[PDB]
């Protein structure tokens, strides 16, 4: 209802207003400067009107930002821009023809206008990003991955070790390009022990400091609530003893793992003298058996997810299948909070009952990012970049089924107390309007505050910091959050396209959201969020794929909705929409995707040639030899 | 009806019987020995009970035959064998459970039994062929294609020629592997003139000989029926003059084309010092633009279809789209003879009216192979191997729609004078039984006679042969006819699978046909059909693909047919059939297809290594330099 929207909007607008004021004040306090401006310290640049920050955020045009933040951050940010390019003219047209037989034909025509515009824009954006990627890569600094190919499923041999098989194999098949190699080892036990040792030290330091300040008796029952019901009577000597125990376990484990041939996985990082050679290995079949001696570009050293390297290659299919099933159940059992929320969604008292379902849904979805990253880690991927992309994919599907589809269905089920979809879709538009103001407008404004790291920064300074530069760990903003930023906005691209020929009233909320998200994230990208890995926008083709899916869904729903008119004869025309859209997808795929998947040999040659000319005496072997060993082994 | 089948079978059996007798006698006459045994003359091995030939044909186990005939001939022949492996147990089971609620479940169960058996067999056959291919290739003699990659769509340049661009490009990107190259030229006008010159000479020789035998007046009006109404009064001097005219045109054209830079196409055959290098080029992207500097393995010198090399790369899409449309109309307008045949298909007089529709259909389809090769040539492919495979594909589709589907529909339309398919399919089984005996049993038996080349051989000896060794042209058996052999048998694989859970009576005809075709073609492969090109069974994955499609079609038709039972509840089970079948296809595709599409670098290295050791002083450059120029230029 209009009264509900009026009230909900006022609530979210005021919260955003207030959050920005609070932000404006907190950021001026010098004691938290390392939280709000964590970058620039990380980069060695810094030491020691409330909304002015908005226009400041618009400085640093793409080329400055790409070098400052990285390509992924810039390409990600452009997604919000993309949506404005697509939806603004849709909103204008839809409003113009829906807001004051022919209605029937109008909807059909609108579908083509919207599809065509969207496809046009996506084509141009896809191409632009591909060009950005090539320039970025061409000018990229030297990194170990440029010369390194990861070899998987090296076949077993009764006499030769993995190292021996790999060296021989490559000297024969890649003679005078082969440089060196490093065998993958199953050091997970060791790494796990080492991480625990560090955790124990933090607690020891905590208690030593607490005691030094107040020289009294400790009573910590491990967890306090459900720990082991002891007292940790000395607590300093308790943690010292626990540390001494693990220290010995670590010394022992290091000696056993480095002398245990069973710690060797049939995999290795293989390096080459030139990038050209690496480029070749990454793109050709090596042996007769298509699932042996497999090659791919190695992740850069801090993209490598070391835990997954211990998974036998051959077990990956099973892990993936199990998770396909788990995903179903995850999606399936979420219907309970959906139905709950839709039940809730039914004068000041009623406007809040109207408002709150938005929040309830948001809260139930709060732990989804965690669940999905965990199941993604279970499936082996071996890199951070791949895992984050995989989880984003699953999140997206979940939103389609649980946030959009199930909500419409559950909605109709409650309202009802054969094409019922005819009213269920426009009916529930009210819900989505409230929802977008809640995890959207208000959400983004709240995020600029960075309250979570603010608090942890200060607590660490208060209790764990003892000396200088341990404040470097306190100062950790995390990443941009591709994992949640992207599937969230895809929900909105879908809803926009679904309702543009139905309910034009939804689009103004979507447009505000895209505009807001753009300015808030641009601001933060510049000041916070140091990147954990540099992908050259590898995720872009997936973003594209998902938008196309949204077009197909909207087109199909329209066909359904207009399939009620007697002698509608809608299908002879509407069928063209998913056909042409799919055709468009394949065209763009074949024409532009190679930019993101295969490295042209010519680029490798130009790059190798120039590097040599610029640096004629590079000890490449020394450079690459110690890369990719393991962080646990120094 | 049983009476119609009895009579039709007797007719076709007796014709086959007689054809074999005639064959048995004609092959014993020495004057046609070069027709029936054309091979063995071509190979330099030969010079100068009626059915004994059947057991003789079973000698020469695969390895002898592969070397004698070639891999393609053997793999092709194995297709008939494959069908027996699939259909025999189907026929046994179907007969056992259909020939003396439960009927409903029985049909569902049979569908899984049949699908599973078929998939099992296909998997094993696919793998076996892949292994054969690798061994064949590993032991293959040296050929120019092993070192040559065809480069397409070389970008234009204002200053450099195509030759100059190619040499430079490869020296930079493939240094010290690049050996040499040859630029593609548009010599089609010249080649056309040369072919006509030869044709005119044959006519001149004809008339000179005719005259020498009978010194009188010629009156040939060019074509006789609708030629130019003149007399060719001298006919010798007429053909001499026509030849002298074309001779001058040829001399001129040769000088203009070899000095005309516009005759150069932006394409070249590029050779490398090693196979390893060629293997790399064929499998990697060369430049930024994914549709420039494109590489693929060059066809061997007598696979190259020179006419298509004059087609600009960029025009290929349009040519293909136009032909997609043409194919529709081709298929569409064939409905007229289909309806005619089905109209015809409606006591000795009636049994023949019953019989003849088989033949009528066969005759109308007689020119389809020609039509399809022509449209395939229109689309550029550049090789004989590709064109033949392409045409076979289209032929297959035509059979599915026009021979199977349209026949069932037209059939029902006539019998009728909502699921009518429920009776239309088993009803028309009678038609297919007659049809298989006609272009099947009788067909193959007739083919062993080789009457067409028999006649032409003798006519040439009588009128064009003047001297020795021009009988070598008379002796030309043509090829195996993959173009028609394969899509024909796919029709029968489909019909078998469609009717196995419906009408078991069809399968005994199919099994006889496969058995007969096997022995007749095996016989002929050994004695006649010199291969025009050697593919290493590249077509195999397509054969596989088509059988899988047949499984899906049968499974879907069953779902339709059993979807009439009240509360059939067939779909919860039957849906598994196309799902599992598709899964199976992807498994096999990913697991085995690489054998037929990509050459492992290791194989290239092993091959290059051994060849060098065996032949330490090979002038590879001299060997490859003159390959791939053009047959017209000497």
Numbering used by the authors:
A (entry chain A), B (entry chain B): 3 to 50, 71 to 122, 156 to 401, 420 to 490, 502 to 718
Lines quoted from the article behind this entry:
We purified Arabidopsis thaliana OSCA1.2 expressed in HEK293F cells and determined cryo-EM reconstructions in lipidic nanodiscs and Lauryl Maltose Neopentyl Glycol (LMNG) detergent micelle with cholesteryl hemisuccinate (CHS) at 3.1 and 3.5 Å resolution, respectively. Structures of OSCA1.2 in nanodisc and LMNG were nearly identical (RMSD = 0.81 Å). A comparison of nanodisc-embedded and LMNG-solubilized structures hints at the positional flexibility of the subunits relative to each other while in the closed state.
